[PDB]
RNA sequence: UUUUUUUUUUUUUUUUUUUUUUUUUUUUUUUUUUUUUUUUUUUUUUUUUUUUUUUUUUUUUUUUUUUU
């Protein structure tokens, strides 16, 4: 317990604690300490051609089984090709050694699924034209069946069809117009493991001949990690370094989210690691890096980036059941600091010519912005205003939020236009 | 042993195998799942004998846990699912009571009233599946006389307890009176 | 007793004690000390197909027996599948150990029901396609039979129908439009034990292939724990640390309510524990976390959250036979403290740049809001305002309660609009 | 690591790090230290006339 | 003790004595009187190529064993070459005699380690290109791991990589960027003995072909001898003689620290001796010349050098829990005497007593001039303390 | 007035730094310059909830309708 609370009628302790309304965070490091592999359960007791017929006729009839599609995806993606150049160690697992050819499924442990295999709709007229487009379509269905919105789903389906025609160019659509059965595919653990493994393998091998499979599996990259996405967007939209941005966090609730966000043993800064797929691989059942688990930090980052005129921070969904006043005030303060006082400081010197004129009327104390990016200077300036937003700050917010046509409901843009456009 | 090296004289408390009686009450729960029904009780002993392949449980009750596993395998009555074709045959057996086991395993540490579950899949070839256990072996200081432990197996099964009781790793012998005394477990185990 | 009570005519004691109009609280820890297992009494002297026919024909005819449905639910939910990654010890009960597969009923002790089995309406034309959707429907009726009002029960039934149709795709509805029988199922103890065990098992294994069964049993999670849920909601809406919130509670009944609410040995902070099912498993006949047993804190927290513009705290039923003046004043004071005076303090620093200017005319004694979040300082301001809330607090309440169209009768929103909107 | 950030509630560091949304740079010198050649994979089991046709 | 202390209720003696919270100083002369050699325990039951592969793959995988690296360092540093010219006797040990070839480990006694040898991950495809750059890297990862600060560690790693790349020119970095395992190497005693022996051998033979090994092992020279280093810095930055500066010290704690520092039988004024490695060779577990066993003199000398405009005396950290006012007064007196009088001690003491022991405003102005305009002062150091107290 | 004994709603003991791996302390360095709610069956108290989510962001690489 951080501190102690006394019941003052007799000086007794009560040690208050939150209820378990939401599951606690789980980190991939703990999972990989528990087990040293990622099990992938599949039923490989069928020929590749028979499995391809199964999946083709199931997609055409809209009654394909997840076990059949998983087994076929394993069977058609055994491309050991792809030669590493550097070591690919991650989370204490030796994926490869800088030169040995590696397959897609060499980075996840493979087991045998224990269950009953469905009968199937086996066909024999399908030739060996599977690897060209069928795994691509099957993986694209995974990304398509996550939008839950007709317009975006239709756009994604059209993009997937175009990508498949890029390689096959005949491609009569397989799944019927209705009867969306690929929605359930995301629930299955093995399918998510397969799609995440494919995504990471083709992210390591960008220039592979089958890199087109990255379509429909890119959603697995950094899945359920909107907090890190918004933190990177904030760090890139302000120009301010992360090591100095992290000092600007306030409201004392962003603090806990930031602290649980940056535990050392996660290597969240390593691209070729298991961190982006902490939930699809099953490493973490509850992703600590999500937006629901980190609502305050997500809201603050999106609002701040919106007040800095960023095209991304206008559609992020505004979280619920969080204090909005303090977060809005902190975001407005940081955004005004970024967009009002450009740093504009000498960086590199040729031997000499480094300093600044301090004796040339260095007036500092006045009713003006501190003309810098130090957090305490702005904090002192704001306290000199007795903790209320000056009308210049509100005018800056209004100019940064006005002309935001086509806003989206429940998003940060609509909330800012309702709040910072009085 | 003494033929090999110097100075391994035995203690004066128990000479080598001083026989002693250890009264103890117990409780037991069992659940054996398999792909096919066990044709013979010998296959049951084979499937249950590896219940402690990776052993985490008690040491002072390990022989007692083995004998309780034997008594549970003896009374492994079937279930309605074991019929012609419903699902995988699931077996069940539970036993509770008090008994005293004559053994020559030396003095046992004082046992407590604590329960430990056990789970382990078995692979005896033809038959697949897992197990389940819940032992409650603990001492009994009451003078209340208890039935002999080996009596808890009905004579209907176990035509030769000298080996049916040995399938689990035990080593049996006869006290020249009709009471079986536990010599020791499997050697070095 | 607290201390002695003397009536001064003869210097005698009265030692008053409350009548047992309502049953005393019961904690799960006491039950688990009394017994080391949770018995489940069922009648297993029937085949799975016969029980499936029994329950199917009973649901179709609207006269299914509770024993038959309990036995069939046990028979169809013997899925030992689901591999634990970590230990699942709870209340001194070893459910599993970091790698051993466990079933739904591996966490509740199983016994044999002592009674006579009803005859049944046995059918033989129903194949073994039951585990996919029939336990889902049977558990969904449990949640459906708690609304007690058609305009919500219809939506719940439609959701259950969609949930089952996503699996079976035919699903002609079984229970008739009227003639409910699933209302009684809540009274039975074994049915609640089974449904809560299913809920907790599928909560531990979220990514299970049969995780859809969580529908209809999610209501069992934190059942009759409205006080704990509203405490968590209050701690999440105020943004303040969960331990500083309990320092703010007042009125002398909320304190004792809190003390009985969080007795240390109850394990209310662990998600995968038996605590959220203290009443469905039979661990406690009267849940101390209920709203009927904890009216004052529920009312005060809901009012505070409503004053903080939370969409959740607008439908909670206003408790009866409690004070509506002291609690309302305390809630208004808390809301004005948190929603007006944002903390907004420096959190992270790089070596230096920590403090605040205390020499820049840091006056304190003024007729202004304290501009802080400490309970003692706001309390001092309030008592300097002679415990009569200022009209600015009324204006804040009016702004936070107005525009709340479509309120619900007997709920917190209606009372707030009738009280803080004079 | 340039400078350290410490949390003023308990005097504890946090070592913040950016996410790898964009892949890190790779330099040609690093590759040429890893390998001393540029592999070009082709299939030469065909005559020039056949391939041109 | 010095003189008796009596309790006047019955005229009884108590002989007060300080508790031994900090271990008493140990001197190299005492150790060399106890034993006439410095043992070095290594496991030589492996081929040189096998040990080379062991250490190479351990560094690559970041799971190397200290025994293997010590054994390989012994195997690859048997360069008996290097011809002496003058006698190299030290602490009564005949290391060499004016014209005999000498090796690195010739100056330390060698024994056989008693223990179990780890497995090793040997790679058999490594040629005999080890002695050129690998021992240098292994010795440099001791100094690199002795920093415990990211910026200094990064700079030292860059310098070590530059030094190594001068020899082989390929040098793919071996230790992984994360999980630094070489910090533990300093804990072991035999590794420190080897690194100190290498440092001293290449300090005597400056113009050796393999003199580049001095990188990383230079930190072993005068290790935990900051008090003697700051005494030399004070003697150099003032130009005043060492025999005359020792009279100026005051406060009666600096006097005791000098007394314990200046034992005659320590030969602290000999460069080619075992003194600078009194703690790496294991001669003394608690060096009397350290900055923690001599905090008062270290603080006083650092402050005095700072007030005399020395760039060195602005990063030494302030010693903890020692009386500062008297030390600061003495340091200010010495600094003003040096900076205003281009030096007798009793004359300045009488001059100060004419002020009944209170610094004059002129001395505070001189200190202000000597401490003003010190940009980028790092925390807890003498510069920060002087800027806080002498720059009012 | 009192049953006798009592007299810290003082106490397990030992403690007394939210001090401590040791060694350190130039974020110096290769070397060399009968009663009386016309109350209640019980449990209830978001006409909240499948889970995971939070851009109608994303094939990778691109960022002169620049170039032999």
Chain C nearest-CA residue for D9: C347
CATH code, C68: 1.10.3570.10
**Tokens, residue A127:** 């030739």
Furthest CA-CA distance within chain C: 88
- Is residue A373 a known part of a binding site? no
Q: Do residues E95 and E244 share a domain?
A: no
User: Is A4 inside any structural domain?
Assistant: no
Residues 6+ apart with CB under 8 A from E157: E144
The crossing angle, in degrees rounded to 10, of helices C226-237 and C254-261 is 110
Contacts of D4 in chain C (CB under 8 A): 350-351
Using the C1' atom of nucleotide F45, identify the protein residue whose alpha carbon is closest. Answer: C317
Measured from the Cβ of residue C150, the count of other Cβ atoms closer than 10 Å reads: 9
Choose among C203, C348, C360: nearest Cβ to A384.
C360
For the record, the structure tokens of A404 come out as: 């935001």
Name the nucleotide nearest A207; use CA and C1': F60
Q: What is the resolution in angstroms?
A: 3.5
Cα(E355)–Cα(E350) distance, rounded to whole angstroms? 9
Distance to chain C for B120, nearest Cα, Å: 8
Residues C342 and C388 in one domain: yes
Whole-angstrom distance, CA of residue E126 vs CA of residue E147: 31
DSSP-derived secondary structure letter, C218: G
Q: Are residues C155 and C172 both part of a single domain? A: yes
Say if residues E389 and E328 touch (Cβ distance below 8 Å). Answer: yes
- Whether residues E315 and E177 share a domain: the answer is no
Give residues 327 to 346 of C whose Cβ lies within 8 Å of D: 346
Integer angstrom CA distances of residue E328 from A50, B16, C46, E373? 90, 80, 95, 20
Q: What is the CATH number of the domain that holds C269?
A: 1.10.3610.10
For residue D1, the chain E residues in CB contact (below 8 A) are: 150-151, 154
Residues E265 and E133 occupy one common structural domain: no
D23 in A contact zone (CB under 8 Å): yes
Nearest-CA neighbor of E281 among E145, E113, E107? Answer: E107
DSSP H or E stretch at residue E306: helix E295-307
A247: chain C residues, CB-CB within 8 Å? 346-350, 353
> Are C100 and B119 in contact (CB < 8 Å)?
yes
Q: Final residue of a domain: which of A185, A200, A220?
A: A220
Mutate to test the interface with C, among B51, B113, B132 (most CBs of C within 10 A): B132
Measured CA to CA, the distance from residue E27 to residue E285 in angstroms comes to 9
Domain extent for C364? 226-420
Nearest CB to E172 within list D1, D2, D33: D33
Query: Are A240 and A194 contained in the same domain?
Result: no
Q: How far apart are CA A258 and CA A294, in angstroms?
A: 9
C94 has a chain B CB within 8 A of its CB: yes
Q: Distance from residue A417 (CA) to nucleotide F36 (C1'), in Å?
A: 63
Cβ contact, residue pair C80, B86, below 8 Å: no
Among E220, E240, E260, identify where a domain stops. E220
User: CB–CB of C283/C276 below 8 Å?
Assistant: no
Q: Give residues with Cβ within 8 angstroms of E114, minimum separation 6.
A: E41
Contact E325, E333 (CB under 8 A): no
Compute the nearest-CA separation of D17 from chain C (Å): 15
Same domain, A179 and A254: no
Q: Closest residue by Cα to the C1' atom of nucleotide F51?
A: C206
Q: Which chains touch A (3 or more CB pairs under 8 A)?
A: C, D
In whole angstroms, what is the distance from residue A17 CA to residue A23 CA? 14
- Please, are residues E321 and E345 in contact by the beta-carbon 8 Å criterion? no
- Asked if residue C86 lies in contact with residue C98, where contact means CB atoms within 8 angstroms, the answer is yes
Please name the helix (run of DSSP H) or strand (run of DSSP E) that holds residue C257, with its range, or none.
Answer: helix C254-261
Domain's final residue, options C196, C220, C244: C220
Flag whether E25 is in a domain. no
| A266, HSE (Cβ side, Cα atoms, 13 Å) | 28
Give me the count of residues in chain B: 189
Q: C266 and C199, same structural domain?
A: no
Local structure of E156: helix, strand or coil:
helix
* Whether D31 and A276 lie within 8 Å, measured CB to CB: no
Do C181 and C296 share a domain, yes or no? no
**Residues of D whose CB is below 8 A from C354:** 8
Domain assignment present for residue C23? The answer is no
Binding residues of E for RNA: 143, 152, 206, 214, 286, 317, 378
Nucleotide closest to E218 measured between CA and C1': F29
Helix (H, G, I), strand (E, B) or coil at E337: helix
User: How many domains does one find in chain C?
Assistant: 2
The answer to whether A206 is annotated as binding is yes
Q: What region, left, alpha or beta, does residue E239 occupy, with left being phi > 0 and alpha being psi -120 to 50 degrees?
A: left
Please give, rounded to a whole number of angstroms, the shortest distance from the CA of C416 to a CA of chain B: 55
* CA nearest to C85 within chain A: A34
The whole-angstrom separation of Cα A274 and Cα A266 is 9
| Residues A38 and A144 grouped into a single domain | yes
Q: Taking the mean position of all CA atoms in its chain, how far away is CA E184? A: 18
In a domain, E5, yes or no: no
Judgement on whether residues C187 and C258 belong to the same structural domain of the protein: no
CA angle C89, C93, C97 (to 5 degrees): 45
C219/C195 Cα distance (integer angstroms)? 10
Classify residue C7: in a domain, yes or no: no
Q: How far apart are CA A343 and CA A241, in angstroms?
A: 12
C96 touches chain B (CB under 8 A): yes
The two beta strands, B171-174 and D6-7, are unpaired
Alpha-carbon gap: C354 to the closest alpha carbon of chain D (Å)? 8
Q: Is the alpha carbon torsion for C296, C299, C305, C311 positive or negative?
A: positive
| Residue C22 forms part of a structural domain | no
Q: Which nucleotide shows the minimum CA-to-C1' distance to residue A315?
A: F55
Q: What is the 3-state secondary structure (H, E, C) of chain A?
A: CCCCCEECCCCEECCCCCCCCCCCCCCHHHHHHHCCCCEEEECCCCCHHHHHHHHHHHHHHCCCCHHHHHHHHHHHCCCCCCECCCCCCECCECCCCCCCECCCHHHCEEEECCCCCCCCCCCCCCCCCCCCCHHHHHHHHHHHCCCCCHHHHHHHHHHHHHHHHHHCCCCCCCCCCCCCCCCHHHCCHHHHHHHHHHHHHHHHCCCCCCHHHHCCCHHHCCCCCHHHHHHHHHHHHHCCCHHHHHHHCCCCCHHHHHHHHCCCCCCCCCCCCCHHHCCCCCCCCCCCCCCCCCHHHHHHHHHHHHHCCCCCCCCCECCCCCCCHHHHHHHHHHHHHHHHCCCCCCCCCCCCCCCCCCCCCCCCCCCCCCCCCCHHHHHHHHHCCCCCCCHHHHHHHHHHHCCCCCCCCCEHHHHHHHHCCC
Chain A 229-288, residues with CB within 8 Å of chain C CB atoms: 243-244, 246-255, 258, 282, 285
Chain centroid, CA A243 distance in Å: 21
CA distance C394 to C302: 18
Nearest CA in chain B to C47: B80
Do residue C232 and residue A5 have CB atoms under 8 angstroms apart? no
**Alpha-carbon span C209 to A187, nearest angstrom:** 7
Rounded Cα–Cα distance for residues A35 and A19 (Å): 29
3-class secondary structure, E262: coil
Does one domain contain both C162 and C246?
A: no
Backbone angles phi, psi at B148, to 5 degrees: -60, 140
Question: Parallel, antiparallel, or unpaired for β B133-135 and B116-118?
Answer: antiparallel
Q: Return the number of CB contacts < 8 Å for A and D.
A: 61
Give contacts of A 97-126 with D, CB under 8 A: 98-99
Say how far apart CA E118 and CA A281 lie, in whole Å: 36
- Residues E315 and C93: their CA atoms lie apart, in Å, by 59
CA angle (C29, C34, C36) in 5-degree steps: 85
Residue with tokens 């079976």: C168
Tell me which chains share at least 3 CB pairs under 8 Å with chain B: C
Q: Is residue C20 part of a domain?
A: no
The answer to whether residue C348 is domain-embedded is yes
E178 close contact with D: CB closer than 8 A = no
Helical spans, DSSP H, in chain D: 28-34, 48-52
CA B155 to chain centre: 17
Residue the block writes with tokens 């002020």: E355
Residue C112 β-bridge partners = C42
Picking from A321, A166, A317, A172, the residue whose alpha carbon sits closest to that of residue A230 is A317
Query: Three-class SS of residue E238?
Result: helix
Interface size B-C, in CB pairs within 8 Å, comes to: 27
Record: contact B80-C45, CB cut-off 8 A:
yes
Which chains are within 8 Å of C by 3+ CB pairs? A, B, D
* Contact residues, chain D, for A225 at CB < 8 Å: 19
Phi, psi of A236 (to 5 degrees): -90, -25
Nearest alpha carbon to residue B78 among B93, B64, B58, B57: B93
Is A60 annotated as contributing to ligand binding?
Answer: no
Percent helix / strand / coil, chain D, rounded to 5: 25, 10, 70
Residues in chain C closer than 8 A to B87 (CB atoms): 48, 78
């Amino acid at each position: 317990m951080s501190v102690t609370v006394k019941r003052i009628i007799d000086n007794t302790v009560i040690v208050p604690k939150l209820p378990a309304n939401e599951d606690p965070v789980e980190y991939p490091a703990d999972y990989f300490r528990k087990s040293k592999e990622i099990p992938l359960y599949i039923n490989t007791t069928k020929s590749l051609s028979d499995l391809r017929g199964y999946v083709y006729q199931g997609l055409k009839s809209g009654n394909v089984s997840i076990i059949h599609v998983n087994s076929y995806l394993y069977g058609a993606l055994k491309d050991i090709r792809g030669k590493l150049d550097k070591d690919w160690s991650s989370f204490g697992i030796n994926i490869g050694k800088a030169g040995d050819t590696i397959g897609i499924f060499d980075l996840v442990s493979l087991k045998a699924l224990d269950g009953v295999l469905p009968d199937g709709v086996s066909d024999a007229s399908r030739t060996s034209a599977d690897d060209k487009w069928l795994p691509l379509y099957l993986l694209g269905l995974y990304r398509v069946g996550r939008t839950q919105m007709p317009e975006y789903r239709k756009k994604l389906m059209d993009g997937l069809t175009n990508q498949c025609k890029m390689i096959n160019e005949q491609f009569e659509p397989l799944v019927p117009e209705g009867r969306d059965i690929f929605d359930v595919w995301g629930n299955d653990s093995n399918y998510t493991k397969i799609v995440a493994a494919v995504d990471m393998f083709f992210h390591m091998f960008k220039k592979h001949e089958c890199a087109s499979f990255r379509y429909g599996t890119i959603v697995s990259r950094f899945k359920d990690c909107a907090a890190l996405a918004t933190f990177g967007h904030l760090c890139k939209i302000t120009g301010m370094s992360t090591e100095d941005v992290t000092t600007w966090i306030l409201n004392r609730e962003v603090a806990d989210e930031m602290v649980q966000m940056m535990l050392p043993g996660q290597e969240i800064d390593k691209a070729d690691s298991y961190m982006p797929y902490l939930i699809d691989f099953g490493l973490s059942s509850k992703s600590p890096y999500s937006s629901v688990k980190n609502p305050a930090f997500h809201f603050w980052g999106q609002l701040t980036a919106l007040l800095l005129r960023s095209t991304r921070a206008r559609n992020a969904r505004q979280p619920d059941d969080i204090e909005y006043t303090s977060l809005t005030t902190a975001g407005l303060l940081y955004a005004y600091a970024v967009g009002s006082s450009a740093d504009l400081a000498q960086q590199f010197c040729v031997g000499d010519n480094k300093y600044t004129p301090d004796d040339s009327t260095g007036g500092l104390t006045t009713n003006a912005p501190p003309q810098g990016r130090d957090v305490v200077e702005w904090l002192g300036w704001f306290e000199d205003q007795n903790r209320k937003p000056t009308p210049d700050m509100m005018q800056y917010a209004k100019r940064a939020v006005m002309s935001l046509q086509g806003l989206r409901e429940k998003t940060i843009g609509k909330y800012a236009k309702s709040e910072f456009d009085k | 042993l003494s033929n090999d090296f110097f100075g391994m004289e035995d203690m004066d408390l128990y000479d080598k195998d001083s026989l002693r009686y250890e009264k103890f009450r117990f409780m037991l729960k069992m659940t054996v799942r398999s792909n096919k029904p066990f044709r013979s009780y010998d296959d049951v002993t084979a499937a249950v004998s590896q219940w402690d392949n990776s052993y985490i449980g008690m040491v002072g009750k390990r022989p007692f846990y083995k004998i309780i596993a034997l008594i549970g395998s003896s009374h492994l009555q079937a279930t309605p699912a074991v019929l012609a074709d419903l699902n995988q045959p699931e077996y069940y057996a539970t036993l509770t009571g008090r008994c005293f086991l004559p053994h020559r395993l030396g003095l046992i540490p004082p046992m407590f009233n604590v329960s430990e579950t056990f789970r382990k899949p078995f692979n005896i070839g033809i038959y697949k599946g897992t197990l389940d256990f819940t032992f409650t072996v603990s001492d009994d200081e009451s003078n209340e006389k208890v039935p002999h432990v080996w009596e808890y197996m009905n004579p209907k099964y176990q035509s030769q307890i000298q080996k049916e009781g040995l399938k689990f790793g035990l080593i049996l012998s006869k006290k020249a009176t009709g009471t079986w005394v536990l010599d020791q477990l499997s050697p070095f185990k």
